[PDB]
Design a protein around this ligand. Structure first.
Ligand code: O5E
Ligand code: O5E
Ligand code: O5E
Length: 263
C-alpha cells in the first residue's frame, strides 16, 4: 500500500525508500524499493560482514592487531581516537565501525579489503548486483542527486542483510558475530528501533549523509513467536540544505504494519 508512504514522504519533503521482508511467509512491503539511495555510513555493516567472510579463510584474523597513528584519524572516530599508537584488533575496529559508526575504523578495514572496490567485490560474491561503494569516509557522504556512487537500493540492502544474518552467506560462527555486532549498535535508538517493541530483539546499522535530507537505517528484527523481519529504510531530498529520524521511525512502523506484524 503506497498511500501512507506517499503522505509520509510528502510531509518529509523528499523520497522514502522501504523494503521489508517477513522471512516466515515471504510477504513483502515495497515503496521506491528499487531506487538508488546513498549508503552514507550504512556501508559499515556490510564492511564488517566482508571482514567476517575474510575470517573464514584467514585464521586468527579477528584478533590480529592493527596499529595506527593520528594520520589514520578521520572526523568522528569516537572509539579509535582513544586507542592510538597501541591500536585495535580487527574485531574491535569492526565493532567500532558498526556500533559507533567510527570513521577511522571503517577506513582502516576498507584498506585491508582493497578499498571500496574490494567491498563491492564481496557484495557481488553474495549475489548483490546493486550495491556499490566508490569512495572512503568522509567523501562518500556527498549524496548528490542522481549520483550512483556509494549507493544501493532498499531491496538490495534487505536481501543482502537477510543472506548475511539469516541465510548461508556467512558460516555459522561469523553469522552470529555479525548479528551480535548489529544488536549492539548505539546509533539507532531513534530510527527503526523506535518502531520496535521493547521485548523484541533488533540489530541495525544507521547512515547519515548530512546533506540532501539523506539518512537511513536497516535492521533485522526478531518478534517473539514468529519469524524474523528484515527491512531497510532510506531517505533523500532534492535540496542540499534539506534536513534528514522520526520519518525513518514512522516508515518502519508502516512497513511492520503492512506486513501484518502487531507491535
Ligand atoms: O573461523 C575460522 N574458520 C571458519 N569457521 N567456519 N567457517 N570457517 C577461522 N578463522 C578465524 C578468524 C578470526 C579469529 C579466529 C579464527 C579459520 C580460518 C581459516 C582456517 C582455519 C580456521
Ligand atoms: O604491540 C602489541 N602489544 C604491545 N605493545 N606494547 N606492549 N604490548 C601487539 N599486540 C596488541 C594486542 C591487542 C591490541 C593491540 C596490540 C603485538 C604483540 C606482539 C607481537 C606483535 C604485536
Ligand atoms: O551522523 C553521522 N554518522 C552516522 N550516522 N549514522 N551512522 N553514522 C556523522 N555526524 C552527523 C550527525 C548529524 C547530522 C549529520 C552528520 C557524520 C555523517 C556524515 C559526515 C560527517 C559526519
Amino acid at each position: 500500500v503506497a498511500e501512507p508512504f506517499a503522505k509520509l514522504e510528502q510531509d518529509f519533503g523528499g523520497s522514502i525508500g522501504v523494503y521489508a521482508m517477513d522471512t516466515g511467509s515471504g510477504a513483502t512491503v515495497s515503496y521506491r524499493a528499487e531506487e538508488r539511495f546513498p549508503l552514507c555510513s550504512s556501508f559499515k555493516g556490510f564492511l564488517a560482514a566482508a571482514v567476517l567472510a575474510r575470517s573464514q579463510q584467514q585464521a586468527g584474523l579477528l584478533d590480529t592487531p592493527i596499529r595506527y597513528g593520528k594520520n589514520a584519524l578521520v572526523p568522528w572516530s569516537p572509539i579509535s581516537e582513544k586507542y592510538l599508537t597501541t591500536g585495535m584488533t580487527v574485531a574491535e575496529l569492526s565493532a567500532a565501525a558498526v556500533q559507533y559508526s567510527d570513521n577511522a575504523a571503517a577506513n582502516l578495514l576498507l584498506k585491508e579489503l582493497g578499498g571500496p572496490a574490494g567491498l563491492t567485490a564481496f557484495m557481488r560474491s553474495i549475489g548483490d548486483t546493486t550495491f556499490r561503494l566508490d569512495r572512503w569516509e568522509l567523501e562518500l557522504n556527498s549524496a548528490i542527486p542522481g549520483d550512483a556512487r556509494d549507493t544501493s537500493s532498499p531491496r538490495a540492502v534487505t536481501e543482502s542483510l537477510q543472506k548475511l544474518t539469516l541465510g548461508s552467506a556467512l558460516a555459522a560462527p561469523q553469522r552470529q558475530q555479525f548479528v551480535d555486532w548489529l544488536k549492539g549498535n548505539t546509533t539507532g535508538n531513534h530510527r527503526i528501533r523506535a518502531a520496535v517493541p521493547a521485548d523484541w530483539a533488533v540489530g541495525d546499522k544507521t547512515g547519515t549523509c548530512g546533506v540532501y535530507g539523506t539518512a537511513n537505517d536497516y535492521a533485522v528484527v526478531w518478534p517473539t513467536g514468529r519469524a524474523p523481519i528484515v527491512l531497510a529504510v532510506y531517505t533523500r531530498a532534492p535540496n542540499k540544505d534539506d534536513k534528514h529520524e522520526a520519518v525513518i521511525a514512522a516508515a518502519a512502523r508502516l512497513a511492520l504494519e503492512g506486513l501484518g506484524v502487531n507491535g
